[PDB]
Amino acid sequence: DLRLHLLLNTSVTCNDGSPAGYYLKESRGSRRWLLFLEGGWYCFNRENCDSRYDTMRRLMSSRDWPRTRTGTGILSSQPEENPYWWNANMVFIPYCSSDVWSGASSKSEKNEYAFMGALIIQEVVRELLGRGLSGAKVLLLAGSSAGGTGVLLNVDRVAEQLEKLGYPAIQVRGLADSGWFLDNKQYRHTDCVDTITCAPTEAIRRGIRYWNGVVPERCRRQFQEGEEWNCFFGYKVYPTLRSPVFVVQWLFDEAQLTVDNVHVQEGLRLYIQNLGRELRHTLKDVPASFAPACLSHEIIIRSHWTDVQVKGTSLPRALHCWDRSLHPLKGCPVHLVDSCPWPHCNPSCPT
Numbered sequence: 148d149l150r151l152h153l154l155l156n157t158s159v160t161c162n163d164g165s166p167a168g169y170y171l172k173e174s175r176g177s178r179r180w181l182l183f184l185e186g187g188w189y190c191f192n193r194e195n196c197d198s199r200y201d202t203m204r205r206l207m208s209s210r211d212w213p214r215t216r217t218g219t220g221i222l223s224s225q226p227e228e229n230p231y232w233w234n235a236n237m238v239f240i241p242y243c244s245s246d247v248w249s250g251a252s253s254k255s256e257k258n259e260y261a262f263m264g265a266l267i268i269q270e271v272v273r274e275l276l277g278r279g280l281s282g283a284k285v286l287l288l289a290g291s292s293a294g295g296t297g298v299l300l301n302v303d304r305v306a307e308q309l310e311k312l313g314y315p316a317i318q319v320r321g322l323a324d325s326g327w328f329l330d331n332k333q334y335r336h337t338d339c340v341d342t343i344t345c346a347p348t349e350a351i352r353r354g355i356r357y358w359n360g361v362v363p364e365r366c367r368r369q370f371q372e373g374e375e376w377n378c379f380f381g382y383k384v385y386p387t388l389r390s391p392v393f394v395v396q397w398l399f400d401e402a403q404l405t406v407d408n409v410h411v412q413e414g415l416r417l418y419i420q421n422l423g424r425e426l427r428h429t430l431k432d433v434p435a436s437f438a439p440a441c442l443s444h445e446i447i448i449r450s451h452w453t454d455v456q457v458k459g460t461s462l463p464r465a466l467h468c469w470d471r472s473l474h475p476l477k478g479c480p481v482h483l484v485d486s487c488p489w490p491h492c493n494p495s496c497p498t
């Protein structure tokens with residue numbers, strides 16, 4: 148189990164002003180630290196945030212969080228379940244800011260909600276330094292879904308924070324799972340008139356304004372004012388990053404298909420095949436990646452994350468090979484992208 152710590156700086160809050168926090172399981176003697184960002188979509192105006200507060204309140208508030216959580220998948224401390232980093236110091240950071248981990252805005256007389264995702268990450272890192280992180284050799288910032296996008300948006304800022312605080316020996320790296328999206332044409336189209344009909348580019352453009360969202364500096368300087376939404380798309384922000392980042396992405400991610408309005412005749416067959424080909428293309432120059440040809444919403448904190456393989460290599464193995472590469476390697480690959488063109492053409496896909 149990982150134990151809850153609410154942030155000592157209570158000005159760093161979830162959406163409703165309750166303190167943010169993190170769950171921690173220390174591993175004495177290990178100098179590896181895994182900080183995992185939870186996912187769970189986002190909200191981008193008062194009305195859709197209000198709805199989320201009614202039925203997804205744990206994603207907007209710490210008031211009902213449990214005292215402990217069980218670490219699973221890459222957060223498991225059992226080598227049987229986590230061949231990669233079972234002995235690491237484990238940190239699960241709940242997603243309670245609804246801002247893809249990008250926000251820097253407090254609740255105030257002008258703001259019904261606080262959007263502090265970027266500040267939550269910084270505050271967790273700061274408070275962990277007093278709990279052993281100061282001795283770390285590697286800090287892996289990992290995350291799934293909106294948390295995977297959050298890794299891309301925040302890994303270089305964590306690296307900069309530690310450098311400025313006087314810890315240049317901690318190697319900051321990113322692991323972005325299921326957060327690599329395409330700003331593509333939908334299979335069926337709707338103008339952004341309400342929440343359902345609004346495509347992610349427009350929802351994110353509105354969200355950045357509502358959240359006071361921040362993006363990595365080099366990407367911000369490329370796209371400039373009004374266009375920072377571009378930095379939420381992996382293939383555009385990744386080339387701007389300095390920290391090593393390993394990208395895990397299903398070629399047919401269920402969230403991508405959902406925003407594309409895909410719920411099989413020739414038109415849809417071609418659409419799906421083109422989506423997989425486009426995703427594969429965006430990963431061509433990503434040297435550390437794992438992209439199986441599966442239709443899935445499954446994530447790296449699931450207990451059976453060890454089962455899927457690309458070209459005969461599992462993700463825990465690929466991550467271990469990545470660790471070795473950061474000290475090509477005979478029999479220890481790090482670039483694993485399926486080439487077959489249809490979901491479940493890989494037999495190891497999740498059932």
Ligand SMILES: *[C@@H]1O[C@H](CO)[C@@H](O)[C@H](O)[C@H]1NC(C)=O
Pocket residue numbers: 156158159266270
């Ligand atoms: C608390 O957090 C806020 C927002 O990030 C920051 O401005 C302030 O300096 C922090 N205070 C302390 C004592 O760390």
Ligand SMILES: O=c1[nH]nc([N+](=O)[O-])c(Cl)c1Cl
Pocket residue numbers: 186187188189247292293294296328329347402403404406
């Ligand atoms: O959490 C998410 N899930 N899906 C998407 N998508 O566009 O497919 C996005 Cl942008 C986010 Cl932030």
